[PDB]
Short mmCIF file of C-alpha atoms in Angstrom, two decimals:
data_model
loop_
_atom_site.label_atom_id
_atom_site.label_comp_id
_atom_site.label_asym_id
_atom_site.label_seq_id
_atom_site.Cartn_x
_atom_site.Cartn_y
_atom_site.Cartn_z
CA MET A 1 -19.34 48.41 -31.80
CA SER A 2 -20.91 46.70 -28.78
CA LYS A 3 -18.19 47.46 -26.23
CA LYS A 4 -20.19 49.37 -23.61
CA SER A 5 -23.53 47.82 -24.60
CA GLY A 6 -23.11 45.05 -22.03
CA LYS A 7 -26.57 45.51 -20.52
CA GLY A 8 -26.87 42.73 -17.96
CA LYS A 9 -30.67 42.67 -17.89
CA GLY A 10 -32.26 41.65 -14.62
CA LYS A 11 -32.55 37.96 -15.39
CA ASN A 12 -34.40 35.93 -12.76
CA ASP A 13 -31.65 35.05 -10.30
CA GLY A 14 -33.83 32.44 -8.61
CA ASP A 15 -34.72 30.89 -11.96
CA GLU A 16 -31.07 30.86 -13.06
CA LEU A 17 -29.86 29.23 -9.84
CA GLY A 18 -32.67 26.69 -10.07
CA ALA A 19 -31.74 25.86 -13.66
CA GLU A 20 -28.06 25.50 -12.75
CA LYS A 21 -28.93 23.26 -9.80
CA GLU A 22 -31.21 21.12 -11.99
CA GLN A 23 -28.48 20.80 -14.62
CA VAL A 24 -25.96 19.80 -11.94
CA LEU A 25 -28.41 17.26 -10.51
CA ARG A 26 -29.08 15.80 -13.96
CA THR A 27 -25.35 15.56 -14.68
CA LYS A 28 -24.78 13.86 -11.32
CA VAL A 29 -27.69 11.48 -11.95
CA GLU A 30 -26.32 10.50 -15.36
CA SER A 31 -22.81 10.06 -13.94
CA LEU A 32 -24.23 7.88 -11.16
CA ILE A 33 -26.19 5.88 -13.74
CA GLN A 34 -23.03 5.29 -15.78
CA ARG A 35 -21.09 4.36 -12.64
CA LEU A 36 -23.88 2.00 -11.57
CA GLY A 37 -23.83 0.35 -14.98
CA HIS A 38 -20.05 0.01 -14.82
CA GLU A 39 -20.23 -1.47 -11.32
CA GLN A 40 -23.05 -3.79 -12.38
CA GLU A 41 -20.90 -5.04 -15.25
CA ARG A 42 -17.97 -5.47 -12.86
CA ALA A 43 -20.17 -7.38 -10.40
CA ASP A 44 -21.53 -9.58 -13.18
CA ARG A 45 -18.02 -10.33 -14.44
CA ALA A 46 -16.82 -11.03 -10.89
CA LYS A 47 -19.77 -13.35 -10.21
CA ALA A 48 -19.13 -15.13 -13.51
CA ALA A 49 -15.43 -15.44 -12.64
CA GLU A 50 -16.22 -16.84 -9.19
CA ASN A 51 -18.66 -19.35 -10.68
CA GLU A 52 -16.21 -20.29 -13.43
CA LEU A 53 -13.42 -20.79 -10.90
CA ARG A 54 -15.69 -23.04 -8.87
CA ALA A 55 -16.11 -24.65 -12.31
CA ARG A 56 -12.33 -24.70 -12.81
CA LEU A 57 -12.47 -26.83 -9.71
CA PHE A 58 -15.11 -28.57 -11.82
CA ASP A 59 -12.77 -28.11 -14.79
CA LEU A 60 -10.17 -30.33 -13.15
CA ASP A 61 -13.20 -32.43 -12.19
CA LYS A 62 -14.08 -32.86 -15.88
CA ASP A 63 -10.46 -33.55 -16.81
CA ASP B 51 -11.21 30.87 6.39
CA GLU B 52 -9.98 27.37 7.26
CA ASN B 53 -7.45 25.28 5.37
CA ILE B 54 -8.29 21.94 3.74
CA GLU B 55 -5.81 19.74 5.59
CA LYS B 56 -7.39 16.39 4.60
CA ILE B 57 -8.81 16.30 1.07
CA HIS B 58 -10.91 13.14 1.37
CA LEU B 59 -12.93 12.39 -1.77
CA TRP B 60 -14.90 9.19 -2.36
CA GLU B 61 -16.49 10.04 -5.74
CA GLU B 62 -15.33 9.04 -9.20
CA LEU B 63 -12.72 11.62 -10.21
CA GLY B 64 -11.23 9.69 -13.12
CA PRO B 65 -7.66 10.25 -14.29
CA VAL B 66 -8.61 13.59 -15.84
CA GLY B 67 -10.38 14.83 -12.72
CA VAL B 68 -7.55 13.66 -10.47
CA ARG B 69 -4.99 15.40 -12.69
CA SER B 70 -7.05 18.61 -12.76
CA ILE B 71 -7.50 18.72 -8.98
CA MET B 72 -3.89 17.81 -8.26
CA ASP B 73 -2.49 20.31 -10.79
CA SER B 74 -4.70 23.07 -9.36
CA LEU B 75 -3.15 22.12 -6.02
CA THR B 76 0.27 22.40 -7.67
CA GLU B 77 -0.51 25.81 -9.21
CA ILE B 78 -1.73 27.07 -5.82
CA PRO B 79 1.21 26.84 -3.38
CA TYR B 80 -1.07 25.33 -0.75
CA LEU B 81 1.02 23.64 1.94
CA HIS B 82 -1.69 23.37 4.62
CA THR B 83 -3.30 20.08 3.55
CA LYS B 84 -1.88 17.12 5.47
CA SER B 85 -3.94 14.31 3.91
CA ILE B 86 -5.40 13.20 0.58
CA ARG B 87 -7.72 10.18 0.60
CA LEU B 88 -9.02 9.26 -2.85
CA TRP B 89 -11.38 6.32 -2.34
CA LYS B 90 -12.06 4.90 -5.82
CA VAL B 91 -11.79 8.35 -7.44
CA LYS B 92 -9.70 6.66 -10.14
CA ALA B 93 -6.49 8.64 -9.72
CA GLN B 94 -4.83 6.30 -12.23
CA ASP B 95 -1.47 6.98 -13.89
CA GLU B 96 -1.93 10.63 -14.89
CA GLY B 97 -3.50 11.51 -11.55
CA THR B 98 -0.67 9.73 -9.73
CA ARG B 99 1.92 11.63 -11.78
CA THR B 100 0.26 14.96 -10.98
CA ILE B 101 0.03 13.99 -7.31
CA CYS B 102 3.74 13.15 -7.24
CA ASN B 103 4.52 16.46 -8.93
CA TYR B 104 2.57 18.56 -6.44
CA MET B 105 3.82 16.52 -3.48
CA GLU B 106 7.36 17.28 -4.63
CA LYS B 107 6.38 20.95 -4.98
CA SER B 108 4.67 21.30 -1.57
CA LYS B 109 6.08 18.69 0.84
CA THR B 110 3.32 18.98 3.45
CA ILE B 111 0.90 16.11 2.82
CA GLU B 112 1.17 13.30 5.36
CA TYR B 113 -1.80 10.90 4.99
CA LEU B 114 -2.32 9.58 1.45
CA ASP B 115 -4.96 6.90 0.89
CA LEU B 116 -5.40 6.17 -2.82
CA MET B 117 -7.70 3.17 -2.47
CA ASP B 118 -9.12 1.64 -5.65
CA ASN B 119 -7.49 4.52 -7.53
CA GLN B 120 -6.17 2.20 -10.26
CA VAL B 121 -2.55 3.06 -9.52
CA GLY B 122 -0.27 1.15 -11.89
CA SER B 123 3.42 0.53 -12.42
CA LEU B 124 4.00 3.91 -14.10
CA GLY B 125 2.22 5.58 -11.19
CA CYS B 126 4.47 3.63 -8.84
CA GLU B 127 7.55 4.81 -10.76
CA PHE B 128 6.32 8.40 -10.43
CA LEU B 129 5.75 7.75 -6.73
CA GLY B 130 9.33 6.52 -6.42
CA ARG B 131 10.52 9.67 -8.18
CA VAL B 132 8.48 11.95 -5.92
CA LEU B 133 9.26 10.11 -2.66
CA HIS B 134 12.96 9.69 -3.41
CA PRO B 135 15.03 10.79 -0.39
CA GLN B 136 16.04 13.70 -2.63
CA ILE B 137 12.46 14.99 -2.28
CA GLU B 138 11.73 14.38 1.42
CA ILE B 139 7.96 14.86 1.55
CA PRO B 140 6.25 14.32 4.93
CA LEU B 141 3.59 11.81 3.89
CA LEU B 142 3.05 9.68 7.00
CA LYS B 143 0.59 6.98 5.91
CA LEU B 144 0.34 5.38 2.47
CA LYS B 145 -2.68 3.24 1.58
CA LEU B 146 -3.33 1.58 -1.77
CA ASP B 147 -5.40 -1.48 -0.84
CA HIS B 148 -7.22 -2.88 -3.88
CA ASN B 149 -4.95 -0.73 -6.08
CA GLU B 150 -3.61 -3.43 -8.39
CA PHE B 151 -0.31 -1.72 -9.17
CA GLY B 152 1.30 -5.09 -8.46
CA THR B 153 4.79 -6.06 -7.44
CA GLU B 154 5.97 -4.45 -10.67
CA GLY B 155 4.56 -1.22 -9.26
CA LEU B 156 6.38 -2.12 -6.06
CA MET B 157 9.61 -2.23 -8.08
CA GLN B 158 8.74 1.07 -9.76
CA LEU B 159 8.33 2.58 -6.30
CA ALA B 160 11.51 1.01 -4.89
CA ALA B 161 13.45 2.37 -7.87
CA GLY B 162 13.86 5.54 -5.82
CA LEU B 163 11.91 4.50 -2.72
CA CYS B 164 13.91 1.34 -1.99
CA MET B 165 15.44 2.89 1.17
CA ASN B 166 13.24 5.93 1.85
CA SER B 167 12.37 7.10 5.37
CA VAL B 168 8.89 8.57 5.22
CA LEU B 169 5.84 6.41 5.70
CA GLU B 170 3.98 5.90 8.97
CA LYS B 171 2.38 2.72 7.63
CA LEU B 172 2.15 1.10 4.19
CA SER B 173 -1.05 -0.75 3.30
CA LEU B 174 -1.27 -2.69 0.03
CA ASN B 175 -4.05 -5.19 0.74
CA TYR B 176 -5.42 -6.79 -2.44
CA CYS B 177 -2.62 -5.11 -4.39
CA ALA B 178 -1.48 -8.40 -5.97
CA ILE B 179 1.77 -8.52 -3.99
CA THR B 180 3.41 -11.77 -5.10
CA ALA B 181 6.44 -13.64 -3.73
CA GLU B 182 8.81 -11.11 -5.27
CA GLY B 183 6.58 -8.45 -3.76
CA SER B 184 7.44 -10.17 -0.50
CA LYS B 185 11.03 -9.82 -1.72
CA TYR B 186 10.56 -6.04 -1.77
CA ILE B 187 8.88 -6.37 1.63
CA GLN B 188 12.06 -8.09 2.81
CA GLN B 189 14.15 -5.28 1.34
CA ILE B 190 12.11 -2.78 3.36
CA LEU B 191 11.90 -4.79 6.59
CA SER B 192 15.52 -5.98 6.76
CA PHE B 193 16.44 -2.32 7.37
CA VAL B 194 17.16 -1.38 10.98
CA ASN B 195 16.94 2.42 10.66
CA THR B 196 13.18 2.54 10.89
CA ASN B 197 10.37 5.05 11.57
CA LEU B 198 7.29 3.23 10.17
CA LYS B 199 4.86 1.03 12.03
CA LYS B 200 2.51 -1.20 10.01
CA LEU B 201 3.04 -2.89 6.65
CA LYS B 202 -0.07 -4.78 5.53
CA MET B 203 -0.25 -7.14 2.53
CA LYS B 204 -3.58 -8.78 3.37
CA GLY B 205 -5.46 -10.33 0.47
CA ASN B 206 -2.27 -10.59 -1.59
CA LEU B 207 -0.54 -13.66 -3.01
CA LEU B 208 2.50 -14.06 -0.76
CA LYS B 209 2.00 -17.82 -0.27
CA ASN B 210 4.55 -20.12 1.38
CA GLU B 211 7.65 -18.52 -0.15
CA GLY B 212 6.17 -15.06 0.31
CA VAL B 213 5.89 -15.72 4.04
CA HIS B 214 9.34 -17.35 3.94
CA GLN B 215 10.92 -14.20 2.51
CA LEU B 216 8.91 -11.94 4.82
CA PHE B 217 10.16 -13.89 7.84
CA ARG B 218 13.69 -13.80 6.44
CA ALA B 219 13.30 -10.02 6.58
CA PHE B 220 11.74 -10.25 10.05
CA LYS B 221 14.81 -12.16 11.26
CA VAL B 222 16.79 -8.92 10.94
CA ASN B 223 13.86 -6.58 11.58
CA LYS B 224 14.09 -5.08 15.07
CA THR B 225 11.54 -2.24 15.06
CA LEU B 226 8.48 -3.24 13.00
CA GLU B 227 5.39 -3.84 15.13
CA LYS B 228 2.38 -4.94 13.05
CA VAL B 229 2.09 -7.07 9.91
CA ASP B 230 -1.04 -8.51 8.27
CA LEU B 231 -0.50 -11.25 5.67
CA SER B 232 -4.02 -12.66 6.04
CA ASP B 233 -5.82 -13.81 2.88
CA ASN B 234 -2.38 -14.19 1.27
CA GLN B 235 -2.80 -17.92 0.50
CA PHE B 236 -0.39 -18.88 3.30
CA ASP B 237 -0.91 -22.65 2.96
CA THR B 238 1.17 -24.58 5.49
CA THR B 239 -1.21 -27.54 5.21
CA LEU B 240 0.19 -30.54 3.34
CA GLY B 241 -3.21 -31.28 1.80
CA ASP B 242 -5.68 -34.06 2.62
CA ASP B 243 -3.61 -37.21 1.94
CA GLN B 244 -3.33 -38.29 5.59
CA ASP B 245 -5.47 -41.43 5.35
CA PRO B 246 -3.05 -44.39 5.43
CA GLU B 247 -5.26 -46.35 3.02
CA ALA B 248 -5.69 -43.35 0.72
CA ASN B 249 -2.09 -42.90 -0.48
CA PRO B 250 0.63 -45.53 0.07
CA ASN B 251 3.32 -43.06 -1.08
CA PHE B 252 1.85 -39.79 0.21
CA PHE B 253 4.79 -39.07 2.51
CA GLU B 254 7.29 -40.09 -0.17
CA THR B 255 5.66 -37.67 -2.63
CA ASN B 256 5.04 -34.78 -0.20
CA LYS B 257 8.25 -34.86 1.84
CA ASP B 258 9.28 -31.69 -0.01
CA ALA B 259 6.08 -29.89 1.00
CA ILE B 260 6.51 -31.12 4.58
CA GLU B 261 10.08 -29.80 4.67
CA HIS B 262 9.06 -26.42 3.25
CA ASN B 263 6.22 -26.11 5.77
CA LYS B 264 8.60 -27.02 8.60
CA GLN B 265 11.11 -24.40 7.44
CA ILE B 266 8.41 -21.73 7.22
CA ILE B 267 7.12 -22.65 10.69
CA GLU B 268 10.64 -22.54 12.13
CA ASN B 269 11.18 -19.09 10.62
CA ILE B 270 7.83 -17.94 12.02
CA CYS B 271 8.77 -19.23 15.48
CA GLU B 272 12.18 -17.53 15.35
CA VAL B 273 10.68 -14.21 14.24
CA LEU B 274 7.96 -14.33 16.89
CA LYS B 275 10.46 -15.15 19.64
CA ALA B 276 13.04 -12.53 18.61
CA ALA B 277 10.55 -9.81 17.62
CA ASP B 278 10.74 -7.40 20.54
CA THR B 279 8.92 -4.77 18.46
CA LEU B 280 7.12 -7.05 15.99
CA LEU B 281 4.15 -7.90 18.21
CA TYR B 282 1.17 -7.82 15.80
CA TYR B 283 0.59 -10.62 13.30
CA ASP B 284 -2.37 -11.45 11.08
CA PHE B 285 -2.17 -14.92 9.53
CA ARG B 286 -5.92 -15.14 8.94
CA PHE B 287 -7.62 -16.57 5.85
CA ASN B 288 -4.58 -18.81 5.31
CA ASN B 289 -4.33 -22.59 4.94
CA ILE B 290 -2.07 -23.06 7.96
CA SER B 291 -2.05 -26.73 8.93
CA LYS B 292 -3.13 -27.68 12.44
CA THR B 293 0.36 -28.88 13.41
CA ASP B 294 1.98 -25.70 12.08
CA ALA B 295 -0.56 -23.53 13.89
CA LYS B 296 0.04 -25.40 17.15
CA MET C 1 7.04 52.80 30.31
CA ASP C 2 10.21 53.30 32.39
CA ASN C 3 11.95 50.49 30.43
CA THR C 4 11.15 47.71 32.90
CA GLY C 5 11.64 44.16 31.63
CA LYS C 6 12.51 41.90 30.23
CA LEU C 7 15.15 39.44 28.99
CA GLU C 8 14.42 35.70 29.00
CA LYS C 9 16.97 33.14 27.82
CA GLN C 10 15.55 31.06 24.96
CA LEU C 11 15.82 27.41 25.99
CA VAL C 12 14.67 25.49 22.91
CA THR C 13 12.30 22.81 24.19
CA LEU C 14 12.45 19.51 22.28
CA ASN C 15 8.85 19.66 21.08
CA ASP C 16 9.11 21.04 17.51
CA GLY C 17 8.39 18.77 14.55
CA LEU C 18 9.85 15.36 15.31
CA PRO C 19 9.45 12.68 12.61
CA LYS C 20 5.84 11.54 13.16
CA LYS C 21 6.52 7.92 12.23
CA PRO C 22 7.71 5.14 14.53
CA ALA C 23 9.70 2.09 13.58
CA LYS C 24 10.31 0.98 9.94
CA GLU C 25 10.87 3.94 7.57
CA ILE C 26 11.98 7.40 8.67
CA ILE C 27 15.49 6.34 9.74
CA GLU C 28 16.06 4.82 6.28
CA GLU C 29 16.69 7.98 4.22
CA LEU C 30 20.07 8.23 5.92
CA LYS C 31 21.25 5.03 4.27
CA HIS C 32 19.31 5.67 1.05
CA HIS C 33 21.08 9.00 0.66
CA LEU C 34 24.30 7.17 1.47
CA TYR C 35 23.40 4.83 -1.40
CA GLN C 36 22.92 7.83 -3.69
CA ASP C 37 26.20 9.31 -2.44
CA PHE C 38 28.36 6.28 -3.16
CA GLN C 39 26.98 6.30 -6.72
CA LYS C 40 29.41 9.16 -7.40
CA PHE C 41 32.26 7.42 -5.54
CA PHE C 42 32.31 4.17 -7.52
CA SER C 43 32.40 3.18 -11.16
CA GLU C 44 30.25 0.27 -12.30
CA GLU C 45 33.30 -1.80 -13.28
CA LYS C 46 34.47 -2.56 -9.73
CA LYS C 47 30.97 -3.36 -8.43
CA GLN C 48 30.89 -6.64 -10.36
CA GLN C 49 34.35 -7.59 -9.08
CA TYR C 50 33.31 -6.88 -5.49
CA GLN C 51 30.09 -8.86 -5.95
CA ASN C 52 32.16 -11.77 -7.26
CA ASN C 53 34.49 -11.49 -4.27
CA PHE C 54 31.50 -11.45 -1.90
CA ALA C 55 30.17 -14.59 -3.58
CA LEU C 56 33.59 -16.25 -3.33
CA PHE C 57 33.99 -15.47 0.37
CA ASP C 58 30.33 -16.20 1.23
CA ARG C 59 30.64 -19.97 1.14
CA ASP C 60 26.98 -20.67 1.92
CA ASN C 61 25.84 -17.91 -0.50
CA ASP C 62 23.13 -16.68 1.88
CA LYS C 63 24.02 -12.94 1.68
CA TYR C 64 25.61 -13.40 5.14
CA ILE C 65 29.37 -13.62 5.69
CA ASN C 66 31.00 -14.50 9.01
CA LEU C 67 33.85 -12.52 10.53
CA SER C 68 36.48 -14.89 9.13
CA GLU C 69 35.18 -14.69 5.56
CA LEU C 70 34.63 -10.95 6.01
CA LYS C 71 38.32 -10.47 6.84
CA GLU C 72 39.28 -12.84 4.02
CA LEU C 73 37.44 -10.60 1.55
CA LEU C 74 38.96 -7.55 3.25
CA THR C 75 42.45 -8.89 2.57
CA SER C 76 41.48 -9.99 -0.95
CA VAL C 77 40.23 -6.55 -2.01
CA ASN C 78 42.77 -4.68 0.15
CA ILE C 79 40.44 -3.80 3.03
CA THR C 80 43.08 -2.84 5.60
CA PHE C 81 41.08 -2.69 8.84
CA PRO C 82 42.04 -3.27 12.48
CA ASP C 83 40.49 -6.38 13.99
CA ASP C 84 38.69 -4.14 16.49
CA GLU C 85 37.02 -1.93 13.88
CA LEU C 86 36.23 -4.86 11.58
CA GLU C 87 34.53 -6.88 14.32
CA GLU C 88 32.81 -3.76 15.65
CA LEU C 89 31.16 -2.97 12.31
CA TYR C 90 30.42 -6.65 11.64
CA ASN C 91 28.59 -7.00 14.95
CA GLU C 92 26.95 -3.59 14.45
CA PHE C 93 25.30 -4.87 11.28
CA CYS C 94 24.76 -8.36 12.74
CA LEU C 95 22.67 -6.96 15.59
CA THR C 96 20.47 -5.75 12.74
CA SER C 97 20.24 -9.48 11.89
CA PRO C 98 19.54 -11.10 15.28
CA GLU C 99 18.07 -14.24 13.68
CA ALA C 100 20.73 -14.39 10.93
CA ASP C 101 24.21 -15.82 11.57
CA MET D 1 -62.53 19.10 11.16
CA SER D 2 -64.66 16.97 8.82
CA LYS D 3 -65.91 19.48 6.24
CA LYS D 4 -64.05 20.43 3.06
CA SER D 5 -63.38 24.14 3.61
CA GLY D 6 -60.09 23.93 1.71
CA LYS D 7 -60.03 27.32 0.00
CA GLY D 8 -57.69 27.24 -3.00
CA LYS D 9 -55.14 29.96 -2.28
CA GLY D 10 -53.27 30.94 -5.43
CA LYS D 11 -49.78 29.85 -4.43
CA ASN D 12 -46.74 29.86 -6.73
CA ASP D 13 -47.44 26.87 -8.97
CA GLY D 14 -44.11 27.23 -10.76
CA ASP D 15 -42.15 27.35 -7.51
CA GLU D 16 -44.08 24.34 -6.18
CA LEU D 17 -43.33 22.38 -9.36
CA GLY D 18 -39.65 23.31 -9.18
CA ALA D 19 -39.43 22.23 -5.54
CA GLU D 20 -41.17 18.94 -6.38
CA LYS D 21 -38.74 18.30 -9.25
CA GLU D 22 -35.76 19.09 -7.02
CA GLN D 23 -37.01 16.72 -4.32
CA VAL D 24 -37.59 13.98 -6.90
CA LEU D 25 -34.07 14.51 -8.27
CA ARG D 26 -32.58 14.31 -4.77
CA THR D 27 -34.49 11.10 -4.01
CA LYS D 28 -33.38 9.56 -7.31
CA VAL D 29 -29.78 10.58 -6.61
CA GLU D 30 -29.97 8.95 -3.17
CA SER D 31 -31.40 5.74 -4.64
CA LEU D 32 -28.77 5.66 -7.39
CA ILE D 33 -25.95 6.23 -4.89
CA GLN D 34 -27.26 3.45 -2.65
CA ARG D 35 -27.50 1.08 -5.63
CA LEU D 36 -23.97 2.04 -6.67
CA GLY D 37 -22.75 1.26 -3.16
CA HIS D 38 -24.49 -2.12 -3.26
CA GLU D 39 -22.97 -2.88 -6.66
CA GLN D 40 -19.47 -1.89 -5.52
CA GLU D 41 -19.84 -4.06 -2.42
CA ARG D 42 -21.00 -6.98 -4.58
CA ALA D 43 -18.08 -6.53 -6.98
CA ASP D 44 -15.57 -6.43 -4.12
CA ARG D 45 -17.15 -9.48 -2.47
CA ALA D 46 -17.08 -11.41 -5.75
CA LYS D 47 -13.44 -10.41 -6.23
CA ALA D 48 -12.60 -11.66 -2.74
CA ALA D 49 -14.50 -14.92 -3.31
CA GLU D 50 -12.64 -15.45 -6.59
CA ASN D 51 -9.36 -14.78 -4.79
CA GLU D 52 -10.20 -17.33 -2.09
CA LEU D 53 -11.27 -19.87 -4.71
CA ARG D 54 -7.99 -19.51 -6.61
CA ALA D 55 -6.17 -19.51 -3.27
CA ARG D 56 -7.33 -22.47 -1.23
CA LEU D 57 -9.11 -25.20 -3.25
CA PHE D 58 -6.51 -27.89 -3.99
CA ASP D 59 -8.57 -30.50 -2.16
CA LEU D 60 -10.07 -31.61 -5.47
CA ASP D 61 -6.56 -31.59 -6.96
CA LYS D 62 -5.09 -33.79 -4.23
CA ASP D 63 -8.11 -36.12 -4.35
#
């Protein structure tokens, strides 16, 4: 059995905290990239909708 | 060793994140927080349900600002459940501007919140409050027993009849102070057919619009004159004709 | 020591947790809870009859009924009220409608 | 002052690289957050412009 053999070797605490911080930063960067893409799509759709409502003015114009 | 009285988060929490945070709040009997401002954290329906649950559990929060949290009609029904006078939570201010829960969400709220006595001020700018949303606004405003201050529906779609119903409520309202219906498409203008050569029958065709504009203006005048407490009005971004404005 | 002092009468100052909210909401739970209370008093059958009677006696159908029509509906549905109390309550709720007749 | 007496002390190259990576990540996060704010502002402005277009117009209709 490996009950008491929980030897917590002296892993580099600085290295571990740096790795955790880098992982958190990468996760935040990817989340921000996804949010920026979502907001860019929303802005593109909103700009298209504004233009196409100016065109709906122009739509009645065409009618 | 300090207590988080105003949990103000402006990052994307999503429905899952909002539910997780709010349910951790529920599981920890933490009654010190007095505000929760989720600015586009995407509380959504599940997050709103969890928030209602923990608000019912705790009854200490007082300043809720769920802006751009994607609160819907089911979230509004849960809010009505939680804020029902049977719950009596102390939430002073409620803000949901740009939260497109709609007037259907307004109904879901009023299901139990029709005659509640909590909010400091209700803001629903760009919430898609329609004419029947103005009907709910009338339901709220026509009440005399009153301990709120500001109800804002700026950027909504109240329009002529929305303002008509809101002023019908104002006629009885005696304590409201501030109201902002700007950007609500309040169009008192009759159009552009005032050139005598342009339209021989313009008046014949638009007498109905003229009468409706006159009625709305008369109601506005009456409410302004008799509003001892109602002393703050925002009719900006509206197509109010020059004669009506004068 | 020596058991000196002291008794002070506790005059409760009116500065403890008043409703933080001014002029549209916090007085409304009284009537909302009254709404929830009558729900046990009344069966749904008579509500429609009373709504019909209100419509009948509200000639202009504007949700507002004058004192005369109010007393007419009182007599119709057996609302035995003194003139004083009837007019008192009618004006009490009319003051809530200063711009409504 | 002018000469090149820059003796190459053997500093912690790994720590320097980690600090450089962390600074780069922070700068990228700041740029992404600023771009996300710009995109959200653009989306809200386009939404408001679309609302105003659907709201007022009516001059073309009456004409």
